[PDB]
Amino acid sequence: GKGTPSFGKRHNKSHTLCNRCGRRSFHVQKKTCSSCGYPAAKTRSYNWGAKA
Amino acid sequence: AYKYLEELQRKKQSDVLRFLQRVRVWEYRQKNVIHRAARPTRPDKARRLGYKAKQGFVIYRVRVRRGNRKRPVPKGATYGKPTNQGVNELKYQRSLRATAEERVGRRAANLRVLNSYWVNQDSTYKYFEVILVDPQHKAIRRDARYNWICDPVHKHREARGLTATGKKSRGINKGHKFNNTKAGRRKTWKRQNT
Amino acid sequence: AAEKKERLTKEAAAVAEGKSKQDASPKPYAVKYGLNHVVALIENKKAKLVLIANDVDPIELVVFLPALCKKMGVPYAIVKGKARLGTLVNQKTSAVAALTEVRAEDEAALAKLVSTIDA
Amino acid sequence: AGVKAYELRTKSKEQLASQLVDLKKELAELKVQKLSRPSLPKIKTVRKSIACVLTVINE
Amino acid sequence: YKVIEQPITSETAMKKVEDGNILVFQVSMKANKYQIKKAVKELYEVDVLKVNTLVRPNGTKKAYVRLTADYDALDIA
RNA sequence: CGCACGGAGGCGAAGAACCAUGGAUUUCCGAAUGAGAAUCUCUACAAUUGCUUCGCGCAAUGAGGAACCCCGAGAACUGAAACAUCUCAGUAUCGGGAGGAACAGAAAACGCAAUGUGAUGUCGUUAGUAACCGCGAGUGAACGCGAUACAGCCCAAAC
């Protein structure tokens, strides 16, 4: 929940750098992402934000 | 010349056509989406819409589903008219025709389609043929007719994607002067969707 | 329809029989090609016999050959193998279709054979 | 200048795998003793020189 | 393409090329340890008795081959 | 001797730097394509498809792009001083896809009804007109006209 620690203690690797997207972004429990691309073979965006 | 294969394909319950229909789709059924075919099922209609034996031509069947519905339900905020809401009642505007034409084309990425139309199907799926062309081929890019469906793909590209075809360019448009209001000035885009 | 016996199918493809004399009549005079031209001959009764392949595709091009043969009164036969009657007419490719307008030379075996069918 | 890609590309592959070690040694060797005394255009000359040779055969 | 890469020079390396006949650098993760052996010997005249392997971390490969009781640490072609 | 003004050293008149054009080299994954992988590793057009000498032999597709364009899916806040149709709006957002522009396009048209016009876009106007609507709030064309630019043709079948 709230940092106590109760969180932060979690010492698990996740969200490392993706092969093709410089940002770490890719989780390891996920498949690929949280920044552009993978799984989609394109670029990642999403309009959750920018108006189009 | 090919009259009665037009005539014949009218009733579809007349006599010979029906029997072929008994043994036809038996095989087609138990054959999944994407097939291919040496000849069209109706020779008049292919070689009507545009099909000739020539290299670079390919005609495929397609199956679809049966009835039209299959839709997701809206989230909350359903309360209302409801407007866009509903469930199994709505029918989708695209035909199980237009759907046959793509869902072909996205099989063969390379080629485009002048589109034929179905043969009938029962208890479920309808079928459809669908001729496609092939743009970078020879003999295709020869005959004046059956040219320009490949220039090479400068404007026409994924025809039937855009829509430009037979069933499409129908469906969302028919007629000309009169009743072409809130229809094709060019189309739905522009003159906001009806 | 009626069933041909692989014995009749010899002799004249154009006739009820299978192709043989059918090669005659091309060397002699008269024949047709495919379904299209053959159909015309029945329409304007010119062909003595015309043949039809059994195989056929779902072509159903040859669907109205019978009834539209039996009005005109043109006898027509069934052959097995589109290729077989394809080959007798000088055609590299096979044809479901038919023939012999004039039936030259074999105005003999032809017409004798027709009698066999519809005996 | 120096080698200049003329001589290269004219030369055979075997020749290329020669004159590619010729610079290599006087190169790495400059790198050692480079610490001793630094080099001016030589290393840097040799590199580039060597570099070009590789992207010749591997063009 | 080349199996070789350039010598790996480090404190660990110089010790090996000291006690222990030798060692080196390497490259080609996609190199076996036979390949680095042959293309070791191909380079200089020495027989390399045994070459080990070593992933890294560096994202490269390391393989320290040691000579055969007849050749010293070259440290000079 | 990049940004990048250092220390060392070096290159250049054997005409370097730098620019143009052309060539060489061009690891691994791949849209990523032999297979796997957080940019490494292990021993081949992956996948779909056309032609086919039926062999990946010859080819196609995939992804990107500021917005624009085309085809589909499609809200709610809001307005009606509440609110259900209506409205916001076919908007936002989503899915698929083309081009340098797209899309339309040579009448089973128009309908100033005519002895009249003559493919299609677009701009101005027609006009907040006709039409819609708790006939509430709101919504809302077209023919024609003046312009811009103009360009008409190919199949199926008969034989």
Side-chain angles (χ1 to χ4, degrees):
Chain A
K2 195 291 180 293
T4 302
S6 61
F7 180 91
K9 60 80 222 320
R10 56 85 92 166
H11 181 85
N12 62 115
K13 293 69 270 180
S14 180
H15 201 86
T16 307
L17 58 71
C18 188
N19 58 307
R20 270 334 312 149
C21 287
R23 297 180 72 163
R24 53 183 70 271
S25 74
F26 84 104
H27 291 79
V28 62
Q29 63 282 2
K30 94 318 359 165
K31 299 65 61 290
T32 55
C33 53
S34 180
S35 286
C36 300
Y38 37 82
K42 300 158 80 176
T43 60
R44 261 241 310 90
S45 51
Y46 184 58
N47 292 114
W48 52 19
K51 277 60 84 178
Chain B
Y2 266 137
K3 268 298 170 294
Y4 74 96
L5 269 191
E6 172 189 337
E7 129 109 286
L8 186 67
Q9 191 69 0
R10 192 63 173 169
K11 189 74 85 179
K12 180 71 268 182
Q13 289 283 93
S14 61
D15 195 0
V16 297
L17 181 65
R18 64 184 180 180
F19 71 74
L20 61 73
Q21 184 82 130
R22 300 287 288 87
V23 175
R24 48 30 301 190
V25 180
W26 171 259
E27 194 160 352
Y28 290 103
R29 185 63 294 288
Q30 71 173 207
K31 194 54 25 195
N32 57 103
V33 177
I34 297 171
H35 205 137
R36 49 164 265 261
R39 322 141 305 90
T41 173
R42 315 99 12 239
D44 177 55
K45 290 174 295 171
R47 305 162 194 80
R48 170 63 175 133
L49 284 54
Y51 180 93
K52 29 56 178 340
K54 286 305 171 324
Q55 192 73 261
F57 264 94
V58 296
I59 61 301
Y60 282 61
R61 304 217 46 79
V62 173
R63 52 290 296 149
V64 289
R65 317 135 323 294
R66 310 128 266 80
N68 58 345
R69 56 295 169 272
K70 47 79 169 283
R71 60 259 72 85
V73 63
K75 66 299 92 180
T78 187
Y79 64 89
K81 180 68 283 291
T83 56
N84 290 313
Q85 199 259 339
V87 187
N88 180 75
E89 70 285 336
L90 57 69
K91 302 302 177 180
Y92 49 86
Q93 67 86 27
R94 60 175 73 168
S95 296
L96 320 306
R97 291 161 37 178
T99 301
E101 47 76 21
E102 87 286 339
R103 308 297 71 84
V104 173
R106 277 326 309 124
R107 193 317 180 174
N110 300 317
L111 40 290
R112 293 71 182 86
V113 54
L114 276 188
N115 299 85
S116 55
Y117 30 75
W118 26 241
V119 289
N120 275 286
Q121 265 292 296
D122 61 35
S123 295
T124 49
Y125 286 36
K126 334 310 150 317
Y127 277 72
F128 213 105
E129 201 53 43
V130 159
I131 302 162
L132 294 180
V133 293
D134 56 340
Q136 59 180 344
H137 205 275
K138 53 71 180 180
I140 171 285
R141 293 265 292 161
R142 287 277 286 168
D143 285 333
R145 57 279 296 91
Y146 177 53
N147 275 340
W148 51 258
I149 65 299
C150 305
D151 63 3
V153 180
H154 90 68
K155 70 298 186 74
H156 50 272
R157 172 205 73 273
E158 213 286 281
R160 264 323 307 150
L162 166 274
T163 199
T165 49
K167 59 77 202 36
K168 287 294 63 50
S169 84
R170 183 163 310 91
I172 53 68
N173 56 310
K174 180 67 283 96
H176 187 81
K177 294 299 288 293
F178 293 96
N179 64 276
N180 188 350
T181 186
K182 185 65 292 299
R185 63 78 51 86
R186 152 264 297 85
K187 207 75 305 157
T188 301
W189 180 91
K190 185 66 63 74
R191 295 276 73 87
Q192 296 75 200
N193 63 313
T194 303
Chain C
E3 294 289 4
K4 60 166 180 59
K5 294 294 77 267
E6 193 278 313
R7 58 180 179 262
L8 300 302
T9 301
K10 288 169 176 289
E11 295 285 349
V15 77
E17 298 301 76
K19 72 300 180 294
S20 180
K21 87 77 184 170
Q22 204 295 107
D23 61 55
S25 296
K27 297 169 182 298
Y29 52 85
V31 286
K32 263 301 153 287
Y33 292 71
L35 191 300
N36 313 310
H37 292 268
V38 64
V39 73
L41 55 71
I42 57 77
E43 157 272 307
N44 57 307
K45 49 80 178 180
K46 294 300 180 179
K48 293 300 176 301
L49 322 309
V50 292
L51 78 76
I52 188 60
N54 182 41
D55 183 9
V56 180
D57 289 355
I59 299 300
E60 290 321 308
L61 277 180
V62 47
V63 62
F64 57 89
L65 289 291
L68 286 187
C69 68
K70 181 173 302 297
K71 180 172 284 90
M72 294 159 180
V74 175
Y76 100 124
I78 299 71
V79 59
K80 199 172 197 311
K82 67 300 179 180
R84 294 288 75 87
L85 170 70
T87 62
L88 274 206
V89 60
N90 190 296
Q91 302 295 128
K92 290 300 180 76
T93 302
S94 315
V96 291
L99 303 298
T100 61
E101 61 175 276
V102 176
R103 178 204 51 181
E105 185 71 356
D106 199 20
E107 296 175 0
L110 186 284
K112 90 78 157 297
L113 302 180
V114 301
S115 180
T116 302
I117 199 293
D118 288 352
Chain D
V3 293
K4 57 78 157 48
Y6 175 79
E7 288 304 335
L8 294 182
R9 182 237 68 267
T10 198
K11 273 67 114 307
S12 65
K13 295 164 181 174
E14 60 91 40
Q15 193 73 221
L16 192 301
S18 180
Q19 287 192 358
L20 78 179
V21 62
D22 300 357
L23 290 304
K24 195 67 8 259
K25 302 169 302 171
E26 170 39 45
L27 172 68
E29 184 175 59
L30 195 180
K31 183 286 187 161
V32 294
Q33 75 180 10
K34 177 165 145 188
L35 301 67
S36 180
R37 299 242 299 178
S39 178
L40 50 295
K42 298 168 180 182
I43 179 59
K44 180 297 96 209
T45 290
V46 58
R47 187 289 321 164
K48 78 64 34 216
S49 180
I50 189 290
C52 66
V53 79
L54 180 59
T55 59
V56 172
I57 62 166
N58 186 234
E59 60 184 48
Chain E
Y1 60 96
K2 69 299 175 180
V3 67
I4 56 79
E5 199 62 355
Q6 65 179 0
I8 193 299
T9 184
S10 296
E11 181 278 336
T12 190
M14 90 273 144
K15 180 67 168 290
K16 193 66 271 180
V17 285
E18 185 176 7
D19 68 305
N21 303 115
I22 209 166
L23 75 305
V24 283
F25 53 109
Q26 73 159 334
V27 75
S28 300
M29 180 162 280
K30 295 304 163 182
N32 292 286
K33 44 294 111 76
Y34 290 100
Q35 293 264 353
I36 312 160
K37 160 70 183 79
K38 184 67 285 180
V40 166
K41 166 75 175 183
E42 173 274 306
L43 291 182
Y44 51 109
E45 58 181 349
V46 177
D47 281 355
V48 291
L49 195 183
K50 288 293 180 166
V51 48
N52 279 108
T53 307
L54 186 71
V55 293
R56 266 322 298 228
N58 190 315
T60 56
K61 280 295 304 206
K62 183 83 319 149
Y64 59 94
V65 176
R66 172 207 64 271
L67 292 182
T68 59
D70 61 348
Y71 200 92
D72 198 19
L74 65 181
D75 64 277
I76 183 169

